[PDB]
Amino acid sequence: TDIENNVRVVVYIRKDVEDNSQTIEKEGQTVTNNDYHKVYDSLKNMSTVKSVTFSSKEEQYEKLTEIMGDNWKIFEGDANPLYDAYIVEANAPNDVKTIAEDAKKIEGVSEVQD
């Protein structure tokens, strides 16, 4: 799942939408997540897309800590501020901007790094 810069789009997900969880909590029971894979589906349907990989904010938070920083006290423990993302690979770099604009239309998307 290593992608070359020139065909990578990062689609960050709204903090209020849980695209990767099949289940959620309702009335104390674990029940089905309606919104599951909506953003994933839209992205994976694009004909110029080759793969769409989930990167959970908790994953990037440990990876962020791995990349220098431990005394980041003033940020950590205080409610992880990172975003769930889809790392998307384009078939050609020519598509990247044609893909990023579309991604930013799909409801549930917060931002998109081209």
Side-chain angles (χ1 to χ4, degrees):
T1 50
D2 51 277
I3 312 179
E4 220 201 334
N5 323 342
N6 49 22
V7 319
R8 110 167 168 181
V9 188
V10 189
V11 173
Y12 302 99
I13 287 157
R14 288 238 136 184
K15 284 176 182 189
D16 33 285
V17 23
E18 182 43 46
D19 199 78
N20 184 73
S21 299
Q22 356 217 354
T23 71
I24 56 159
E25 181 261 303
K26 200 65 165 291
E27 295 306 328
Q29 327 296 301
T30 142
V31 302
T32 76
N33 176 5
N34 271 10
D35 299 356
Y36 170 70
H37 266 20
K38 294 298 156 199
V39 174
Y40 178 89
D41 287 350
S42 286
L43 291 169
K44 197 67 186 277
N45 273 332
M46 308 184 180
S47 44
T48 47
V49 184
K50 172 175 171 189
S51 74
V52 188
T53 303
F54 186 73
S55 169
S56 79
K57 68 176 162 284
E58 294 88 28
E59 276 181 305
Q60 313 162 40
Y61 192 59
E62 282 166 343
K63 188 53 193 284
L64 189 62
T65 298
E66 173 185 288
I67 314 152
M68 31 118 218
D70 43 22
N71 155 76
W72 285 43
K73 292 172 128 57
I74 86 161
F75 272 114
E76 306 180 348
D78 165 57
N80 172 351
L82 306 179
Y83 306 77
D84 295 350
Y86 282 118
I87 291 97
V88 185
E89 162 186 17
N91 298 147
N94 281 330
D95 309 301
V96 166
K97 280 284 67 183
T98 199
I99 276 161
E101 297 185 300
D102 295 6
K104 199 162 72 164
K105 294 167 177 176
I106 307 168
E107 216 1 52
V109 172
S110 172
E111 285 292 315
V112 312
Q113 170 181 0
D114 45 357

